[PDB]
Amino acid sequence: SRGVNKVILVGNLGQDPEVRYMPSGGAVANFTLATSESWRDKEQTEWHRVVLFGKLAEVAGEYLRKGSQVYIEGQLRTRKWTDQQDKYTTEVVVNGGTMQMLG
Amino acid sequence: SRGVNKVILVGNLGQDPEVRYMGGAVANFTLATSESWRDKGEMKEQTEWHRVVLFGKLAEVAGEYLRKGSQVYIEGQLRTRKWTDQSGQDKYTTEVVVNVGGTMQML
Amino acid sequence: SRGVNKVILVGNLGQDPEVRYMPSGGAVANFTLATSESKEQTEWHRVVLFGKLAEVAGEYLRKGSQVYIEGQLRTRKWTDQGQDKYTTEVVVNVGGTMQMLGGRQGG
Amino acid sequence: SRGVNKVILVGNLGQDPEVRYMPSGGAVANFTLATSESWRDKQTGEMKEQTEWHRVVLFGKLAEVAGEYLRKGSQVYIEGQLRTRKWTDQSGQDKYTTEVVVNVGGTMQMLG
């Protein structure tokens, strides 16, 4: 493998985790994570799209709710999709990655 | 300051850095990282392209010394910004932004 | 600079932060932070904070507090009553932070 | 599994890696890694340099890869965790060593 692609997030879920099961039986979870920065000339929030697979996805479905504080270690992935044109979404994907609930 | 938003990358510039002066400098370039896995059986490979943006001294350093193919270490944060393109379509871009608490190191 | 020296910790304070003032007047906080892998084994990390963050730690942190630490490794040499001793600490530098995560361990 | 214990290093080997094989059969490698930072004292204006030497330990394939390809002065990327281990020395002194340990879930990457 060439280079390093690593994301570390701590923040709060903006909604309940959505868990879907793949025909194979592999769990997949999605949720958004808020991080913010406040400074004096001000507050700016960043919303991260997190994707979890397998057991970690199942853990998210059991235990995570809107407002839950989690730690995320994942990788950046930009994927192309089209809808009713070309759209691109950059996600934080947990594959070597971990998820830990902090409350 | 509320939560943690941290990106760490090691990779190679996909082109020469674009440097513009505002007085603070702003530089941008793309970074390739790749993972290689073996098929279930051939050595396969996928590259990920990251959009990096630098501000101040780091941007100026990038313009001086970085070129297409340079290997760098980046520590920054994620920012998704919205723009409408000239067709009226709302578009979003996620970039890796290196401000003060971030670094860039040439390897 | 030359190379990268980065430690990232999430865990719980082993004791109350010890805050002392240096001759210079700068604040310094010291405490231990526990991390564990599960068979279960605990790693105790020696954390050192300086200035405003150290005072913040003394005000608001207690034994059992969950914190996030971003710092760097420093091994410092000190002699005992006369053998040479070394301690490796996680020191929160310019580019580092400490963030209170809320919640606390019990007994 | 409880909390987070992560070290990230980029630096240069201070020696060739020593690779011993355990009786179990798994390889173990160790070497020291130098990281340095340079800054100008904001109060005094002086230029300052400080080097930090890290003790790295690798297991399994990475240990073997290190023995094959890494040498003194090689630039590597390390991701691992901190471990402090206790030992009494032949003089009877309790001693402590903090190492950067790369197990499963860590990586070692040759740079350049």
Side-chain angles (χ1 to χ4, degrees):
Chain A
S1 305
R2 170 104 167 160
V4 171
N5 172 1
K6 180 155 279 304
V7 186
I8 280 140
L9 300 171
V10 171
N12 309 85
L13 273 71
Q15 280 307 159
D16 291 323
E18 122 151 8
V19 189
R20 62 214 156 175
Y21 278 92
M22 286 343 242
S24 43
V28 188
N30 312 254
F31 52 84
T32 60
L33 224 49
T35 61
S36 39
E37 267 190 333
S38 65
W39 68 95
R40 242 236 153 268
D41 232 287
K42 317 327 304 151
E43 181 296 330
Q44 177 110 334
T45 289
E46 196 63 39
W47 292 97
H48 310 269
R49 281 129 278 144
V50 178
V51 183
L52 303 177
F53 300 95
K55 32 215 158 123
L56 281 190
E58 258 184 291
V59 175
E62 265 137 47
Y63 295 107
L64 284 196
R65 326 248 228 256
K66 182 180 135 97
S68 284
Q69 182 174 246
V70 295
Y71 167 94
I72 296 291
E73 227 185 278
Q75 357 186 285
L76 277 177
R77 169 185 84 198
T78 301
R79 64 171 166 87
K80 169 192 261 142
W81 59 279
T82 70
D83 68 0
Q84 351 119 17
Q85 329 154 87
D86 275 346
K87 274 327 201 65
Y88 295 84
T89 298
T90 301
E91 290 162 334
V92 169
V93 166
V94 184
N95 278 325
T98 51
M99 193 272 296
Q100 265 192 59
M101 324 175 28
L102 311 177
Chain B
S1 323
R2 228 97 66 201
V4 171
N5 174 354
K6 176 170 299 289
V7 181
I8 293 158
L9 311 166
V10 168
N12 316 102
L13 268 65
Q15 78 285 81
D16 307 307
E18 263 180 66
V19 205
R20 303 160 161 191
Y21 285 78
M22 299 337 262
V26 181
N28 60 86
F29 53 76
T30 73
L31 224 48
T33 59
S34 34
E35 304 176 284
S36 49
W37 70 92
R38 280 135 298 180
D39 191 306
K40 277 293 207 110
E42 145 170 71
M43 176 114 87
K44 278 331 227 172
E45 205 258 28
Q46 173 79 244
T47 281
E48 186 74 24
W49 287 102
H50 310 271
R51 292 144 300 272
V52 181
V53 186
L54 318 164
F55 293 103
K57 239 243 231 300
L58 288 187
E60 303 169 17
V61 173
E64 250 167 311
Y65 305 101
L66 291 187
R67 217 71 59 182
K68 158 163 194 143
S70 306
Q71 191 186 50
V72 308
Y73 167 96
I74 294 287
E75 158 170 0
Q77 72 196 62
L78 292 165
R79 187 199 56 198
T80 302
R81 62 187 172 86
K82 173 159 191 254
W83 47 285
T84 301
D85 67 46
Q86 26 181 42
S87 310
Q89 167 201 210
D90 281 14
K91 289 223 234 173
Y92 293 88
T93 306
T94 297
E95 304 171 304
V96 184
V97 162
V98 182
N99 195 196
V100 197
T103 83
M104 183 276 299
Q105 256 189 51
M106 309 175 255
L107 319 175
Chain C
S1 266
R2 201 185 300 290
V4 171
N5 178 354
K6 187 157 273 279
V7 179
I8 288 151
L9 308 172
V10 175
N12 303 96
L13 267 60
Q15 327 73 14
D16 266 20
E18 201 190 332
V19 185
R20 276 208 114 105
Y21 287 85
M22 267 207 317
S24 149
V28 172
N30 273 265
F31 54 81
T32 53
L33 191 165
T35 65
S36 27
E37 278 216 307
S38 46
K39 107 171 150 355
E40 141 169 63
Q41 173 197 203
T42 305
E43 198 53 47
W44 287 101
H45 314 271
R46 280 87 77 204
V47 174
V48 187
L49 326 170
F50 298 103
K52 228 281 106 62
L53 263 198
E55 287 174 1
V56 169
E59 200 88 284
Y60 294 107
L61 297 183
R62 310 272 132 65
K63 188 168 119 90
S65 289
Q66 222 197 12
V67 303
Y68 167 90
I69 290 290
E70 196 182 318
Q72 74 196 63
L73 283 168
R74 182 191 67 210
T75 299
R76 58 172 177 90
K77 181 151 33 168
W78 52 268
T79 60
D80 64 16
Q81 262 158 326
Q83 143 116 322
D84 251 2
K85 300 264 255 152
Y86 298 83
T87 312
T88 297
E89 303 168 311
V90 176
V91 169
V92 169
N93 53 295
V94 42
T97 63
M98 174 293 281
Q99 196 173 305
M100 281 150 262
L101 299 189
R104 180 200 179 149
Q105 325 218 80
Chain D
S1 312
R2 178 74 290 261
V4 172
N5 173 5
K6 175 166 291 282
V7 191
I8 289 137
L9 300 171
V10 176
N12 313 91
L13 267 83
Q15 83 214 30
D16 286 329
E18 314 167 41
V19 178
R20 71 225 319 130
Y21 300 80
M22 286 167 0
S24 337
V28 179
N30 56 274
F31 46 87
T32 74
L33 206 74
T35 59
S36 48
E37 23 187 307
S38 152
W39 74 98
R40 170 187 191 102
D41 179 323
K42 286 342 290 148
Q43 147 182 63
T44 278
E46 182 143 272
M47 220 62 199
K48 302 292 238 305
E49 173 254 288
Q50 165 79 224
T51 290
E52 202 68 37
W53 288 99
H54 308 280
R55 270 126 125 113
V56 182
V57 184
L58 310 180
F59 292 86
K61 273 79 132 160
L62 301 184
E64 295 175 332
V65 178
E68 171 97 329
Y69 293 116
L70 296 177
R71 61 215 198 97
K72 180 187 261 88
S74 300
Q75 208 193 27
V76 294
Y77 168 89
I78 292 304
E79 181 178 316
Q81 55 191 55
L82 290 173
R83 189 193 57 201
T84 306
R85 66 190 167 85
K86 172 164 195 178
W87 45 287
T88 306
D89 174 47
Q90 55 163 12
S91 169
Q93 292 301 123
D94 278 2
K95 276 199 218 152
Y96 296 84
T97 318
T98 296
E99 305 165 309
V100 176
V101 177
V102 180
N103 312 56
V104 58
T107 60
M108 184 288 283
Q109 191 157 135
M110 303 189 28
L111 309 174

